[PDB]
Design a protein around this nucleic acid. Structure first.
Lengths: 422, 95, 160, 105, 78, 99, 78, 95
DNA sequence: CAGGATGTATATATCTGACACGTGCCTGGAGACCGCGTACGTGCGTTTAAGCGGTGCTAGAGCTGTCTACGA
DNA sequence: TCGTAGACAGCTCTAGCACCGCTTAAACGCACGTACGCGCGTCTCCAGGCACGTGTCAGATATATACATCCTG
DNA sequence: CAGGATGTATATATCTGACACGTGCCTGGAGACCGCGTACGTGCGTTTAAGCGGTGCTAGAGCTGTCTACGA
DNA sequence: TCGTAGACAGCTCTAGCACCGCTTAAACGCACGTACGCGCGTCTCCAGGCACGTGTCAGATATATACATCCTG
């Protein structure tokens, strides 16, 4: 038992930031042009200035426990469990045969045979056109096919290109893989030992003529959280380290006082802190503390960072003789609520407060923010409280390209009668 | 102690980009210097002669690549021919 | 599917047919003024593999030799098939009487089968593929190739 | 400013511009000549390395042996030529046995 | 045709030039593939050598210097 | 009938085995003799680096590996499985070491 | 003895290194003559290369550079 | 008309000493220039490199012969090695 | 066991053109600093096209003078 | 900074390309059969060197010997 | 037709040393200008010496400063 | 003429050579037999690069499994 005294991250230890207790009724937002919002074949059902709740996916008829955000891929896994699929089935992103592509349907149980052998899905992973499911037994499922830097189709190096049919992935690292890390075509698992593995491209270690898609490691030491955005990676060693190695075009790793990453460096934590969670996008990165105060860095051109003009940091990028360019320094601001967890996209930051209160600080021109008809960008966060989910206590936040996957359940007296405060 | 200007460091550095962990041997980490040796050499003479059999007393890129193409094998050539192109365009686009 | 994926699937079906030696949807029949002829018992689509021109493989005169002894005895029919398999005359002499059907296929310039070289890891294999949709009952035919003046003088059916 | 910084290839392309001059390849040698060469050299150094990197992982754990390195160069049909007049030390043969050598019954 | 160009009474000719006692059946066009091969290997580097000086008319010395580099330096013209 | 392996299987493994190792297969001390021997006919009273020494083995060790390799075809291509004297020579001519 | 030095379980060893299925009787010391030959060809030019710089201790790189000139450039040391 | 400095004359002259009548061909009288070409060449580089792998920035006779010996075949070498020796001693003994 | 049909070694008349030597010229070099069996050979008839030259058209190699951006 | 090689428009003219009927050498086709595959640094002075022109002897040429050599009744 | 004797693929504890990264330093790089038959394989016993290191002796490679004859 | 590479005496110290008993791997010898051969450019500023020192994880190591594989009654 040499491998026993070695594992430093557990499945249970990552249960907080994925699955929940009560079967929550889901929701949607933004322009789902690729039938991604999950509102049928209707052209009228595509547009959405503000929030909603699912007709084909009720809270008690589907039992939606675990979700999965993404650009043209929005899937889910119940406690049963199930394999709900709402995405652009072009690169095999649905994971089935199906328009019915915009009709949320559970993928059959015969597809994955660990559900026919005592096991359940820990989390649902969704890249730009990728899919994979870290099963509890140890083996990892798969689906879809990643879009390359040049721009072409590949699944498992050269033995598979488009993986529409969902299949298990073979042995990669003996220690069972704990969590996942989506974003871009850049899937980045984490072993039981703490061996930051990596499949797809991860372009922003380096190579040519394929043969890299299918692997595998390496880098890092013993990372507990692997937290991937689109073209920005995030890692943290069990020895309380903070790293981020990716395409730092607009300081998306926060390891540069000046405005790509060679070998992981990132964070300078003063005094003490514990990062509860983190997530990012193409030019918009964020990690939150255990106390409550946030710590995000990104660009300041698309309004990805929520710090509207007046609240502009000293260590921030500019143009030659123009407007503010970027914010590569962390900070959670002062005028900001008790954020519990987080979710991110291209530049549409769907946050989540301690009272379940939504606050969309990003580019809401395609109504990803979800604050009615307004073409401008959300320069700071936006307290959302409409007819459907004003009272309803929010659970699992989400974001993709032009979307923001809402959800939860209707609240009781314990909400209004306790949080009547104003 | 005369300074042995070995590709050791440089040979090591380019390893990291391709592969981070690890990883070499002493015998091989010499073998690398003799892959850098034979190329730097073989390349320079299909560069040198090129200049003589095209009458120009200065080895430009004009030659270096022409050899490079003429010296590297089929698919590899176009690759490094591309990577030169790149390092050619970046060298020109500097401050 | 791509052009490469269809060619690989077409090659894997042709390799399995050459390995098994299956000659299904084909039966021998006595054609009027041609000795033995091959006729279809089932409908063969355009591009479908019919049957391999099976026999004894060998070099250039390594088939044109039993020629100089098979001219010494006229009864044994001309069943040699020469071909250029990668710069070198590689053939398949089917003079010996066997149960294979490719050697009994008759001649026609506008028939319903074309002869092609099918390589399988270095070893050449003459295969007969349907040029058009072959009807059930109709005779399988292919262009023999020998349009020379000496051969056409002895048997005039080679012209048509 | 380092020229290798500028052009963006690792293996010092000032040592290429300076090896060239006093290497006596010719009388003159343009700035890019070292550069394009440097990048010729490194697109080799790299294309080479990783073949081992993938192979050395495969057989061994992390670090490349010599007989790993050449265990690569034999197998890449392109390099197989490049390093077809050479003799990489400690290599030994990428194994093969003739068809008329293995068992038969 | 081109490869048909290297015709039997010439392969043979070329082969009797090394005391070939008898050419076998297949052996003949094998020479065409080879003579192709050899042609191929050569003309390419040579044209490539014409390229690196921008000649649309390919030189003899280009053929030669390339015929050298390959490894069988021919003498006479050059 | 004690335990035995039919003639060929053993040395076939010898291939498996010897084709696996990067282990210079002819004794060092022995070659240093042969090394120093051919020295004399070159230049009487000489020294050589132990380093250098190895290479000399290395190459001719290697040289031999492939020239025995190439030699395998020489009898493979002669209706033979077992490599005799001529076989070794034939290869020398196709290399042009002699002819 | 020197040529006796290259001993049977080493010729063989070296020969199994190219899949030699069986060494014949005569074949063995033929390797000694060859390994002599090869040794001979080499050490000579090499020593000759030590000579042209006046070293009484022969360099490794001398072996190498000579091991190059001959035609089988070895890599590693050099 | 750029001047083609061909060994023609010189190639002819040395014929006379060895053989007076005659005697050459056009094809061959080129073949001679390509025996003078490959030697002048091959010789210069085992001369050139010699200087590099014995660190001296000037090609003396020191090298030229060392190559000459190292480059010419067995009995021939000692011969031309002798003929150099000669042309070496005569060059020094001039006015 | 041997003399006669093939075609190669040999001899000598005879025209042709490339080897060879003279000349004005100009630049580079010198000076001071065993057996079944079929594949391929041999030889003669039919037939394809290589080799021949006669020659007009002009692509493009080769050389020159000028302006100027390259690299020591 | 600055000497100058390289870019380059401009221009002489060698030499490569297409033409095209014709004597015929040669590629092609084929029948017979037997040997053989196959299985069992710089300024200056100047003459050495090269492009050019021109006469003829080495050698290609061809009719014509004699000769060595291979093979069946 | 198949189970048991060889020895190869595989797993994991554990010490060792070479890979790898930090540092003062100094010079090179930067900047402005089918069948008879015997030969060779397989396996175990006898025996030669390779490999091991421990180490003292010093040849001779390597580096430096000086004088001066070589060659651009 | 004259800048300077090369000759060369002088000197530090790496590294090659001889030593030499000993555990033992390996070369050697030999008997049995079956697969197999064989016949039928320059002055100046300075940081990139290398020699040096030092800590430890990749890998050599070894006892110890389990495993694929070859072969006769």
């Amino acid at each position: 038992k040499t491998h026993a005294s070695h594992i430093i991250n557990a499945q249970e230890d990552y249960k907080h930031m994925y699955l929940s207790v009560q079967p929550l009724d889901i929701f949607c937002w933004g322009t789902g042009s690729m039938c991604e919002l999950g509102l049928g074949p209707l052209a009228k059902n595509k547009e959405v200035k503000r929030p909603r709740l699912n007709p084909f996916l009720p809270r008690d008829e589907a039992k939606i426990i675990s979700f999965a955000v993404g650009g043209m891929h929005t899937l889910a896994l119940d406690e049963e469990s199930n394999v709900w699929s709402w995405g652009c089935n072009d690169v095999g992103a649905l994971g089935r045969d199906t328009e019915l592509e915009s009709t949320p349907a559970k993928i059959p149980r015969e597809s994955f045979p660990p559900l026919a052998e005592g096991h359940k899905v820990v989390q649902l992973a969704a890249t730009d056109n990728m899919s994979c499911a870290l099963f509890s037994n140890g083996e990892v499922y798969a689906w879809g096919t990643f879009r390359c830097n040049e721009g072409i189709l590949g699944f498992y190096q050269d033995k598979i290109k488009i993986q529409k049919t969902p299949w298990k992935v073979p042995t990669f690292s003996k220690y069972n893989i704990v969590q996942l890390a989506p974003g871009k075509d850049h899937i980045l698992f984490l072993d039981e030992e703490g061996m930051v593995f990596a499949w797809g491209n991860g372009q922003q270690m380096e190579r040519f003529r394929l043969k890299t898609l299918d692997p595998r490691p390496f880098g890092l030491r013993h990372v507990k959280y692997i937290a991937s955005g689109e073209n920005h990676c995030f890692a943290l060693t069990k020895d309380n380290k903070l790293v981020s190695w990716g395409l730092n075009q607009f300081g998306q790793c926060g390891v540069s006082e000046d405005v790509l990453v060679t070998k992981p460096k990132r964070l300078a934590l003063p005094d003490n802190v514990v990062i509860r969670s983190i997530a990012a996008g193409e030019h918009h990165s964020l990690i939150l503390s255990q106390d409550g105060d946030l710590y995000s860095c990104g660009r300041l051109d698309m309004f990805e960072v929520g710090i509207p003009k007046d609240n502009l940091p000293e260590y921030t990028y500019k143009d030659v003789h123009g407007k503010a360019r970027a914010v590569p320094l962390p900070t959670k601001l002062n005028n900001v609520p008790k954020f519990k967890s987080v979710a991110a996209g291209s530049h549409h930051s769907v946050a989540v407060a301690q009272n379940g209160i939504a606050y969309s600080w990003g580019f809401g021109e395609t109504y990803a923010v979800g604050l009615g008809p307004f073409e401008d960008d959300t320069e700071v966060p936006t307290r959302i409280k409409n007819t459907a989910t004003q009272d309803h206590n929010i659970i699992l936040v989400g974001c993709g390209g032009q979307f923001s996957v809402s959800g939860g359940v209707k609240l009781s007296d314990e909400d209004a009668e306790k949080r009547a405060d104003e | 102690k005369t300074r042995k200007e070995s590709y050791a460091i440089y040979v090591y550095k380019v390893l990291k980009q391709v592969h981070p962990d690890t990883g070499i041997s002493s015998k091989a980490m010499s073998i690398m210097n003799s892959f850098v040796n034979d190329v730097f050499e073989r390349i320079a003479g299909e560069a040198s002669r090129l200049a003589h059999y095209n009458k120009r007393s200065t080895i430009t890129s004009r030659e270096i690549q022409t050899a490079v193409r003429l010296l590297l094998p089929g698919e590899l050539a176009k690759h490094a021919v591309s990577e030169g192109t790149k390092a050619v365009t970046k060298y020109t686009s500097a401050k | 599917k791509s052009k490469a994926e269809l060619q690989s699937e077409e090659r894997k079906r042709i390799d399995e047919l050459i390995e098994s030696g299956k000659e299904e949807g084909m039966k021998i029949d006595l054609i009027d003024g041609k000795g033995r002829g091959v006729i279809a018992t089932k409908q063969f689509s355009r591009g479908d593999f019919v049957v391999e021109y099976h026999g004894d493989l060998i070099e250039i005169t390594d088939a044109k030799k039993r020629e100089a002894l098979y001219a010494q005895d006229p009864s044994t029919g001309c069943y040699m098939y020469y071909f250029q398999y990668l710069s070198k005359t590689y053939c398949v002499d089917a003079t010996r009487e066997t149960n294979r059907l490719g050697r009994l296929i008759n001649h026609s310039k506008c028939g319903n089968c074309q002869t092609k070289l099918h390589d399988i890891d270095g070893v050449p294999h003459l295969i007969l593929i349907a040029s058009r949709d072959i009807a059930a009952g109709e005779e399988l035919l292919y262009d023999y190739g020998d349009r020379s003046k000496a051969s056409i003088e002895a048997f005039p059916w080679l012209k048509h | 400013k380092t020229r290798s910084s500028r052009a963006g290839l690792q293996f010092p392309v000032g040592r290429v511009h300076r090896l060239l001059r006093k290497g006596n390849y010719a009388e003159r040698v343009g700035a890019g000549a070292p550069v394009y060469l440097a990048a010729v050299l490194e697109y080799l150094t790299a294309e080479i390395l990783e073949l081992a990197g993938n192979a050395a992982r495969d057989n061994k754990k992390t670090r490349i042996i010599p007989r790993h390195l050449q265990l690569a160069v034999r197998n890449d049909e392109e390099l197989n030529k490049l390093l077809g007049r050479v003799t990489i030390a400690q290599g030994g043969v990428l194994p093969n046995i003739q068809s008329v050598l293995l068992p038969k019954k | 045709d081109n490869i048909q160009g290297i015709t039997k009474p010439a392969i043979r000719r070329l082969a009797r030039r090394g005391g070939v006692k008898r050419i076998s059946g297949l052996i003949y066009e094998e020479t065409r593939g080879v003579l192709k091969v050899f042609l191929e290997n050569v003309i390419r580097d040579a044209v490539t050598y014409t390229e690196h000086a921008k000649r649309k008319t390919v030189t003899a010395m280009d053929v030669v210097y390339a015929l050298k580099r390959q490894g069988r330096t021919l003498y006479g013209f050059g | 009938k004690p335990h035995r392996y039919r003639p060929g299987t053993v040395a076939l493994r010898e291939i498996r085995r010897y084709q696996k190792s990067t282990e210079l297969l002819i004794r060092k001390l022995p070659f240093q003799r042969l090394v120093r021997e051919i020295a004399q006919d070159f230049k009487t009273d000489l020294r050589f680096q132990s380093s250098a020494v190895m290479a000399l083995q290395e190459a001719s060790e290697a040289y031999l590996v492939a020239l025995f390799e190439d030699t395998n075809l020489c009898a493979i291509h002669a209706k033979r499985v077992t490599i005799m004297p001529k076989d070794i020579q034939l290869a020398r001519r196709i290399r042009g070491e002699r002819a």
